[model samples]
Target: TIEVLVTVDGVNFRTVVLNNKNTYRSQLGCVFFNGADISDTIPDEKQNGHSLYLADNLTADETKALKELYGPVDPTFLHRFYSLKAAVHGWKMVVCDKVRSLKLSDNNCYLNAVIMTLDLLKDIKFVIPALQHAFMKHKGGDSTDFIALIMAYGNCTFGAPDDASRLLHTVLAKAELCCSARMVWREWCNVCGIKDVVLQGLKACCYVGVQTVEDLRARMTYVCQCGGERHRQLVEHTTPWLLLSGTPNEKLVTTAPDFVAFNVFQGGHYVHARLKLILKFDSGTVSKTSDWKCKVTDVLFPGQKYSSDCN
Candidate 1:
C-alpha cells in the first residue's frame, strides 16, 4: 500500500491511500506538508522517517556520501541531499533551481559541462583551447549562468517524457532573464554548424540569419561585449581564421567544403572580437582525416564562396 498525506492549507491535512490495479506499480507523487519544504513522514529502512526532497540541512553522513559518489560535492551544496537517481534524472532540477537562486558558485562549471555536452550536441567536434577561450571571455568571465539560462528557456528535450520543459521555462521566466537566451544561442550557433545534423536543424529553425560562410565570418568580427571597442581595433584584422578539415597527412600533401574551423580566437591580440565560426568551403579540397595540415595566413579573406567583410 502507498499512502499520500497532503495539505491544502497549513491548518489541515488529507490522507490518500492507493492499492488498486489502476493505481498500479510506478513512481508516485510527493507531498509537501510544511513550510520548511519537507515532505510528509514516510517509511524508511529502519523506521518511520521524514523523506525530504532538496532539504538544505544535511546530516554529516549524507554530505559525505554525496561527495564520494559525485566526485565534486559543491554542486550538491544547495540541497545537500540525493540518491543515485538524483545525479541522473534530478540534475536539471538542481541546475534550474541553482540558476534561479543566482548564486554564481564554482559548481556552474560542472553544470555548464552537463548541458554543453548533452547527447543532442554530441556529434559536433570541439577544439579544447577554443572552447576554453570562449568560456573565459564571454558573459563577464562566466558563461555558465547563461548556459543554465539556455537550458531553462530553450525547452530542452532530454529524451524523457517526464522532463517538463514548461516548468523549466516558467522558472526561468520568474527569474527574469528572458532576453538573455538569444545572446547565448547566438554564440552557440557560431560554434556548431551544418555538418552536425541535429544542431544544423536547430540552427535552420532558430538562426535564420546565418545561412552561409560570410554570415559566420561577419558575426565573428562583432565587438566583444565583455568591455570596449579598442578591444576590437586592437587585433590584426589581416590574420585569417584557420579552417581545419581532413585527416593528418601521412606525407603532408593538403584539405574543405565540409571543413570545421578552429582557433578562431587564435589567442590574445584579437581575442576580444573573435568567435569560433563554423563555415563551409565550396571550392577547396576536403580531406578524410589522414590528409590534413595547418598553417597561418594574412589578408582577412572571405571564407571560400562566401561574402564581403562589411554589409
Candidate 2:
C-alpha cells in the first residue's frame, strides 16, 4: 500500500494511505460526497436533490478526512445554498412548456430575493443617488423622507443644491432637535462676513480673483435667504453700504475704498477720516475734518457688507 506523511514545524502531523482501497477506507469518499452535494445544490444548475444523497452517503472516515483537508464547514452554508436554489427554481418554475407551480409563500421568497439584489446594487456609489431620487419621488416632501434620501446617497456624497436647500430648511424647522443649529449657523455666517470683507478689500486692491459687485451681490442674496440656522445672523449682516471718498465721480463706485478700509479694521471699534480740498482759492487752500465713528458691524464672510449702523 502507498503511504504519505504530512509534517509541520519539523514534526510529523499526520500519516495516511493513498492506495485506492486505503483511500476508500480513509475519508476521501466522504469529502468527495460533501463537495458533490454543495456543487449539485448551487443555484441554476442541472442536478437537483442528487447532491443531498451524496452528503447522506458519506462514511465516518470520509467525514473525518473532509475536516482534515478542508477544515470545519458551517452548517449554515448548506442552508444558504439551498435557499438560493429555491429562489432560482421558483423564478424559472415553468420551463420548456412544463408548468411547475410554486406555493404563494415560495413566490414571496422569490420577491424578497429580488429586493435584496436591488439593495445590494444600490450600495454602489452612483446607484445610491438614483435610489434616493426614486424614494423622494414616491415619498413626498416630508423631512423624514428627505433624511432617508440623504441616507440612501450615503455620507460621502457631495451635497447638491437641492440637498443643501432641503437640509437647511429641515434644520431650521427642527431647530429644537438640532439645538446646535443656531450656533453653527452663526459661526458660518461670521466667517462668511469676514471673507466678504477681505474679498472687498482685495477687490479694492484690484485682485484678479475678486468678483464683480453685481456677482457678489447676487451671491450675498442667496446666502441671506438660504433659510438655514444661520439665516437670522446672515440677514442681520446683509445690508448694503455707501462708501464716501475724496473724488466726486467716485461717489457711486461699488468697489469703494472706504468699504475696504472698514473691512480691514474689523473686530475692533475705531474711527477713520479723510482730508479734502473744500475751498480752492488762488493760494490753493484746503480744509481737513476727521469724520470718524465707532464701527457697529460684525463682518462675516462673503455673505454681507458692514458699516457703522450695522454695529
Candidate 3:
C-alpha cells in the first residue's frame, strides 16, 4: 500500500493497494490514504468510476512499517516518515529499497559519497515533497508519485530511473574529492554491459526481484565507487573517499558510506566471499578467486585493511 495524493476540489490523500498489478494503471480506482497533508478530506472525484492513483509505490508491509514509525500522518515533520520503500518504481525500486533494508551499518564509511554528501541535498527534503505533490495524479505519463518527483527533478545524467541520477553522478565525480568508488563499480559492470539489463531487466540487483544480500552488500560500497577507468588511466580524477585512507605506501582512502543502512540486522553482519567478481581490472592480469573470484571488502578501498564485520 503506497500513499497517494489526489486532487478534486481540494487535495485528498489516502493509501491504495499498490503493486505491479495495480500501479500506474490509468483510470483505475484510487484508494484513500489518511492525509499527512492535512488539507481536509473532500469527496473523491471518480472519472467514469475510477478515481486518481498517484503513489510512490511502497510494498504493503513497508507501508505498514513506515506508518507504524511515522504514524498515518503528522504535522511536525512532513517527510521524516518517508520510507526507503517510498522510492521503488518497479524491480528497480525493489533493488534500491531492499539493498537499503539489509544490514551493513558498521562496514561502510562516508565522506562526501554523493556530491555535497553533506549539505546541498538537505534542501531536497522539502523539494521532494513539493515535487511529489506536483507529480501526483498527472492525467497521463507513468502515473506514480515516485516518478512524478523525478520527472519534476529528472535530467539527462545517469538515470537510475530518474535522470538527475546521471547529473548527480557527474556532480559526485566532478567533486573529485572522495567519490571514486562509483566510477570503479560502473566500469566493472560496464564490461559486462549488463548494468542496464541487470538493474532494469525485469529485476535489478537482487531483492526477491534479485535483490540479494551479496548484491545489497555491493551497494553500500558500490554507491561510492567510480566504477570507471578514464581518470584512473591518466591523472587521478578524484581523491580518496573511503572512511580511512590506506597505509603510507597505499592509496589514500576517504570515508565511504555507512554500514548501518536499514538496520535489518541491527548493528551489522554480512559475510561475503570476497571477489572482484564484477569489479574493474586493467593490470592485464585478472583471474578467478582461487577458482571463483573473491577479495576482502577493503581491496576496493585500495589501501584500507579489512576488518571482519562478522567477527
Candidate 4:
C-alpha cells in the first residue's frame, strides 16, 4: 500500500493524502448507475485552461518519487487525479433517472435507490426549499439563501425569464413592505406635501445579482405619481431627504430611490424627480443612516426652464 501525503502552505495550508488503493479506485466500479446526469460539465483544460496553482513541499526523495508515480505536478496531472478522486467518492456522478420504469419490476427497492441518488443532488433539493422559506419569512437583502436563489434561478437547468421576472417582483414586493413599514415615505409625503404616490408598476424586470445600491437603481422601474397644482408652492423648496433602512435579507427594502411625478403648477405642467431614499442596511438590528440625493429628470411646463439633472 503506497501512501503519499502532500502538503502545500502559504498564509494558509492544505494537505491532501493519496494512496495507491484509492487512486485507482475509479477503475473498479462505474460512478453512475441509472439516473439523470446532474453533474456540472467538467471544464476543458486544454481549450480553456485552468487557473489553479498548487505548490508541493517535499523532500528530494519524495519529490522524485511523486514525479515518477503521478507525473509532474502540472495542471493536467493535478486536474485529472483530483477529479478521479472526487468521482471515487461519488461527487461527480450519481444514479438518478427521471423515468419510473423501475416500478415495473414489482420491487420498491429500485425506487428507494433512485430516491437516494436524487437526494445526493443537494442544491435543488435543499437550496430551493430554504430559499422559498426565507422569501416567505421576509428575509431579504444579503443573505446566503438570497444570493443562492438568484444563481439557482439563472442556472442552465432552470433559466426561465418568467421565473426570473417573478423573482424580481418578489424582491420589489419585499422592498415595498420595507417602505410601508418605515417612516421615509411618510416623511417624504409630509415634506413634499403630496397626498399619495401611485404605483406605476415596474419599467423593467431584470434584477439578477443585485448586491449594491447602484445595481438596484439600474434595474429599478417602479414609479409613483403625486399630481395636481400642489407642487407650485414647493418648487423652490426641496423635499426633505429621508433614511430607508432594512435588512439585506430584504433587498431594496424601503431604502431604494423611488421616482415620483410632480405637478409644478396647474395646466398640465409636470416634473419628474427621483425621491432619494438613501439606502441604509441594519447591521446587527440597528439602522445606519445616510443622506439621500434626489434628481429632477424631465419638465413638461414651458416658459419655465426647470433644470433636468438626472446625472
- Candidate of highest lDDT: 1
Off by over 4 Å in 3: 1-47, 53-88, 93-124, 127-129, 132-148, 156-166, 169-311
Cα lDDT, model 2, residue 71: 36
What tens digits encode model 4's per-residue C-alpha lDDT throughout 205-236? 11133333233223222233543222211111
The lowest-lDDT stretch of 10 consecutive residues in candidate 1 is 265-274
Q: Per-residue error at 22 for model 1, in Å? A: 17
Off by over 4 Å in 4: 1-130, 134-143, 155-279, 282-291, 294-311
Poorest lDDT segment (10 consecutive residues) of candidate 4: 178-187
Angstrom error of the Cα, residue 196, model 1: value is: 33
TM-score of each: 0.22, 0.17, 0.21, 0.19
In model 3, how large is the Cα lDDT of residue 296?
A: 19
lDDT of 3 by residue, 1-311 (tens): 23344432133434333333332333223223332221223333332233332233344654554444333433222232222113223311111211211111222111111111212221122222343343234222233343323322322122222222233332222122211222112222343332311122111111221111233234222321445432111111122222211111212212233321110111222121112222111111222322322211222222222222221
Candidate 2 segments exceeding 4 Å error: 1-75, 93-110, 113-311
Question: Highest TM-score among the candidates is held by which one?
Answer: 1
RMSD of each: 18.6, 27.9, 19.1, 22.4
lDDT of each: 0.27, 0.26, 0.25, 0.25
The CA lDDT at 74 in model 1 is 47
Error of 3 at 169 (Å): 9.9
Between prediction 1 and prediction 2, which has the larger lDDT?
Answer: 1
**Clashing residue pairs for model 1:** 246-289, 247-289, 247-290, 247-291, 247-292, 248-289, 248-290, 255-285
Ranking by TM-score: 1, 3, 4, 2
lDDT of 1: 0.27
Tens-place lDDT per residue, model 1, 1-311, is 44544332122334445443331122233323222322334433331232323333334654454344322334433232222222233233222212211222323222322232221121222222323233334323344333433332333333222222233223222222111111111232233321111221212112222233333444343433443321111111221121211211122212333332221111111000111232211112111333423221111222232222232
